[PDB]
C-alpha cells in the first residue's frame, strides 16, 4: 500500500516515520535487514541507492551494490 513498507510481508505504516523512510517506502528494520522478500524475490535495501536490489547485485557482506 502507498503508506506502508514495501516488503511483501510487512505492514508497518510509514506516515509517522522519518521522511527518509517514508520517501523510500521502507521501515527502519527492513532498511537494515540482510534480506527481505520484495515483489516476490529476495532483496536487500541498498544504502547507496536507497532502494532494494536483488541479492546478486551485492558483493559479500556489503550493504551497497557494486
Amino acid at each position: 500500500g502507498s503508506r506502508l513498507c514495501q516488503v511483501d510481508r510487512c505492514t508497518v505504516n510509514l506516515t509517522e516515520a522519518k521522511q527518509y523512510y517514508r520517501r523510500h517506502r521502507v521501515c527502519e528494520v527492513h532498511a537494515k535487514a540482510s534480506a527481505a522478500t520484495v515483489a516476490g524475490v529476495r532483496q536487500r535495501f541498498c544504502q547507496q541507492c536507497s532502494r532494494f536490489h536483488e541479492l546478486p547485485e551485492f558483493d559479500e557482506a556489503k550493504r551497497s551494490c557494486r
Binding site: 522519518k18 521522511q19 527518509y20 520517501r23 523510500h24 537494515k32 544504502q47 547507496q48 536507497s50 550493504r63 551497497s64
Partner: protein, 100 residues
C-alpha cells in the same frame, strides 16, 4: 580535525539551525524536524537522521558528501565519525556560534 587522508574536514559556523535552512545545497540533507545533531549514512534528501553520541553542546550536524557508513543512534561520537568517511572527500561539520 583538518584532514583524514583524502577527506577534508570543514567546520562551518552559523548563528543557529534556522540559518542553515538558507544554505544551498546542503539544507536538503538536513532533517529539520529532528532534535539533536545528526549525521548521514548515505546521500539522500533528509538523510542526516542518526543521533551523534554525546555531541558538543553547540554541534548542529555532520554531512559526509559521498559514500556510506554505519547508521545508528547514540553510537558514534564526532571523533569516531571523523574516521568513518569511508571514501567521502568532504566532511562538513555544522556549528552554532557561541561567544566566549
Amino acid at each position: 580535525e583538518e584532514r583524514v587522508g583524502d577527506m577534508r574536514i570543514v567546520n562551518i559556523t552559523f548563528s543557529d539551525i534556522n540559518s542553515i535552512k538558507n544554505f544551498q545545497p546542503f539544507s536538503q540533507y538536513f532533517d529539520f524536524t529532528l532534535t539533536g545533531p545528526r549525521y548521514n549514512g548515505n546521500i539522500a534528501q533528509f538523510a542526516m537522521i542518526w543521533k551523534i553520541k554525546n555531541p558538543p553542546h553547540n554541534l548542529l550536524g555532520v554531512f559526509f558528501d559521498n559514500n556510506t557508513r554505519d547508521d545508528e543512534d547514540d553510537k558514534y561520537t564526532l571523533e569516531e565519525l571523523k574516521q568513518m568517511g569511508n571514501g567521502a572527500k568532504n566532511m562538513y561539520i555544522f556549528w552554532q556560534y557561541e561567544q566566549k
